[PDB]
């Protein structure tokens, strides 16, 4: 118990790293791919499910599907798989050793938050955790206490006016338009 891990479940990418470092130690897109063909060769029983840069490399024979759509999770199995991958294969840090920090967009359903908290506390039995907002963390990173945030992510774009020492929850606007619609 010396530091904590901060994980940002971005709508199109995942950022993770230790608390204190100035750069993330793991930057891979949120892809959970599965084989689409039958398979003939016998010297391979490999990984019915694929995640991460591996999925990006061999994307030509996989049906890539984004677990998170416009800021709201649609498939919980994919999200748990990506969480397990990031925690073990990349970070190689047990959940019990350090706590975890999670972030989510504003005006999200309470069901998602409750399910995420329950899964984190039950499956990985993390000692402690917290839920925050990306915009406030943007303010903290910018070293300012007053302004307006334009958090135009891959899945959601939102603004949250702030003032010295307080916020204005009644002036929050969330727009579904984001990078995915631009790509389409």
């Amino acid at each position: 118990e010396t530091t904590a891990l901060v994980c940002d479940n971005g709508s199109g990418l995942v950022k993770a790293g230790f608390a204190g470092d100035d750069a993330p130690r793991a930057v891979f897109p949120s892809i959970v791919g599965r084989p689409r063909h039958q398979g003939v060769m016998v010297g391979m029983g490999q990984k019915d499910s694929y995640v991460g840069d591996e999925a990006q490399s061999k994307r030509g024979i996989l049906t890539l599907k984004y677990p998170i759509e416009h800021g709201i999770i649609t498939n919980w199995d994919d999200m748990e798989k990506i969480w397990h991958h990031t925690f073990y294969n990349e970070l190689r840090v047990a959940p019990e050793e350090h706590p975890t920090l999670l972030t989510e967009a504003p005006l999200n359903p309470k069901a998602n938050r409750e399910k995420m908290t329950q899964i984190m506390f039950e499956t990985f039995n993390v000692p402690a955790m917290y839920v925050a907002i990306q915009a406030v963390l943007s303010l903290y990173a910018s070293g300012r206490t007053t302004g307006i945030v334009l958090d135009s992510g891959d899945g959601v774009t939102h603004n949250v006016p702030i003032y010295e020492g307080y916020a204005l929850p009644h002036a929050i606007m969330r727009l579904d338009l984001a990078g995915r619609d631009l790509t389409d």
Binding site: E69, H70, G71, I72, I73
Partner: peptide, 7 residues
Amino acid sequence: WXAXCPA
């Protein structure tokens, strides 16, 4: 989502 938008 359930109503409005997909998710």
